[model samples]
Target: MALRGTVTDFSGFDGRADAEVLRKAMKGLGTDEDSILNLLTARSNAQRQQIAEEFKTLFGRDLVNDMKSELTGKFEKLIVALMKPSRLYDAYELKHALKGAGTDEKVLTEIIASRTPEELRAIKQAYEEEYGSNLEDDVVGDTSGYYQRMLVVLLQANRDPDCAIDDAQVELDAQALFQAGELKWGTDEEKFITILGTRSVSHLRRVFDKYMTISGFQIEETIDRETSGNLENLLLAVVKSIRSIPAYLAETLYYAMKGAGTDDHTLIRVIVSRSEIDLFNIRKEFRKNFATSLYSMIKGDTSGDYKKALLLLSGGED
Candidate 1:
């Protein structure tokens, strides 16, 4: 599939231009949020980092700290999200998701299940470095049972990207999956791990298709009936990620805005992280599924510079 991302590496990128505008905006009695939004949102993440460094070097001030003092609420979050390197940003996010009280499995699944290997590797590195604990160890400490196994497999981030599928192997695996789940009295969790968590995306799609034909139901539906709780959600997310990651993310964006109370962290995380990856496709899927524009939805749910910043990263309207 030809992937689409909204923010590409900007041509003629200049951090100084951004640094000047941002400084002028934040230095005064009141902040020029629009100026900050306009400058930050228009640039790529790499460019934003350049500007962030310049902000520190030029003003002898930490940009994020200054902005934190100046900006507040979701708007602040939007910029702060932009300011950090994607890996570090993602590390903190995963840390928070796994932090305190009950593990926020939704956040955990959303992050761990959806990321590509390169992305996952970086997050794993960041998780270890930023938190001063091993990512795998932390995961082992926090989770248990079948879910833990699947998460650990993913945490390894060793899914062979170049693996290819053969027709015979596809059918064999498909029936195996059927026998592992619906065809049996009980689910074979290891079978699921091998197929869902470890296989290549292209190969897995074939397995799911063959499984659908054999079982007379989609693999996802079977997962729903066979599994429960985080395992269920995690497996479903893995399937969605393999089949259509953008589609899965689009649903995530909708759910964040759907019910009472917005999941702004999720909302911010998906858009910001994917802006330079495949957010354009995600936006298309969001519009197709929700019957409303992604931009329109954000406009409705958020306000001020936060709304504007989100819309900017979203590549504007659905």
Candidate 2:
């Protein structure tokens, strides 16, 4: 079924199973663990709390605590994380993964790259408050060199929610790109860096169009000639992906699990979060880009519980 409504709306629970419905669900019932887990896990924090209260009134126990008894480790962590009332709690969990001994580099990178600016800022503040230390300092202590710098820059650059691109800004960006890349000797690397680094995706789209009109070549192609290494590639990817996020994510999922062992966390998180949003469109994009169904791709690449969770998240038929 489609998501009850937007994240803000709590009206979606009308007539759905709860503690009250549990008794009926339990009539001749084998444990419907998956169904209950799915229902509770998918709800927003407010909705989950409401369900928890209803669960207690109907069953006389904590819904989350019961779920905790049923599930384990990362799966349990994911479910509990989903039930948290504050986004800060989610941030704290991620920070714990990054800061503890034998840090998971992949998790750190994905969290830094994938989170929206506002979310990152909130996370940063929450991290500081919880740890009694600056989040940036902690990250710096834990990581080193370019990767560290990138993470710090990203955290510091958290864009506020009200930020938006102005059409006229594109013209300014075009002029700067022309002066930096085309007009100057050996390229004005600073100006190139500033534009590529600072502008939001929406703004960059306009800048790229204007840059092409003024300079007679695409901004990405120019960057390819001027810069080297993974940093350049990352910059290009961010620009391209921002213009079309769903397409980017579709491509990301395809690559994350196309061969041997699946990247289980990536598969789980992407499918779960995107399912209620652009996932339907991303699925179409994935098929168009890969010439295969995402569902089929997952089937070929994964097995057992991991695969089952992903398929269920996709809300696809068994």
Candidate 3:
């Protein structure tokens, strides 16, 4: 099971009342950005969806369309992202990632690598429903070689079920991985891809453990030396996710905010997308791994209502 989530369904949520409040927030001369974000951020996406429906019911106005006219920049993006059902939002991100001159491999890997099989299945459904194209086709056209192969494997959304580990299979898989990567002169990317991509998380954990004893190097260390570019990153992501998804996300969150300029889109993507699912565990992992807190990072990196909404969705501090 995923670790506890930050956002839960609000107690005694009133959708019609919320629609009225949102109407008032946007109705006046100056839009009440604070009221809009504060109210929307507090409620779950499902709740927000109802509010959107009711907004039209009461005011004959679309909440997002109205907000888009009033709001600007990152705050606007955050609210619009929140308004989407989680599955649809993911499908949207994937389509955005694939389009344009260069693929947003980080977004591609992060979404495809981390989502559970069931979540991926829903995303596939949503992708077709939203875009009227198969997700795998988009992925195939945009990426190539082993990277595309690994992505196609994941996009199949057919990872083995996360059932109890098999001790014998664990040992064999570890040996196979060692021989495929560290013990060989040239890498067998497919072996790495097949075993890592298809194995259950519970099964992979034992394989990672046994892998350590056989190779004297962590699987990550081996991958680092053997592979290059997007394939390497995708494989490493699968490993990181299998180890701990929240930890993987914490690293993603850290990098998004760390360098010369902030990867605002990534920050927005993770915080808004994960708010209701596993941001709680991500907060814990962020604190432990970074020697600081996620709240402080947002405080340092972002400003104004955007910061406020992200902090709010993060479920407050470490």
Global CA lDDT computed for model 2:
0.64
Candidate 2 colliding pairs, count: 0
* Structural similarity to truth (TM-score) of each candidate: 0.95, 0.69, 0.97
Off by over 4 Å in 2: 1-17, 20-32, 41-45, 53-62, 72-81, 84-93, 100-105, 129-133, 157-193, 210-237, 275-277, 304-306, 316-318
State the lDDT of candidate 3 residue by residue for 18-65, as single tens digits: 999999898879988898888988999899999899999988888889
Clashing pairs in 2: none
**In terms of TM-score, which candidate is strongest?**
3
Better of 2 and 3 by lDDT: 3
Q: Which candidate ranks first by lDDT, i.e. highest? A: 3
TM-score leaderboard ranking = 3, 1, 2
Compute the lDDT for candidate 1: 0.85
* Error of model 2, residue 87, in angstroms: 2.1
Clashing residue pairs in candidate 1 are none
- Write one digit per residue (lDDT tens) for candidate 2, span 213-284: 998988888877766554455555555555665676777789788767667666665665554456776777
| CA lDDT scores, all candidates in order | 0.85, 0.64, 0.90
Off by over 4 Å in 1: none
Q: What's the C-alpha lDDT at position 281 in model 2?
A: 66
Q: What is the lDDT of residue 236 in candidate 2?
A: 58
Over 185-241, each residue of candidate 1 has an lDDT whose tens digit, in order, gives 989989998888887888888888888899999999989998999899999999999
Q: Pairing residues by index, what is the TM-score of model 2?
A: 0.69
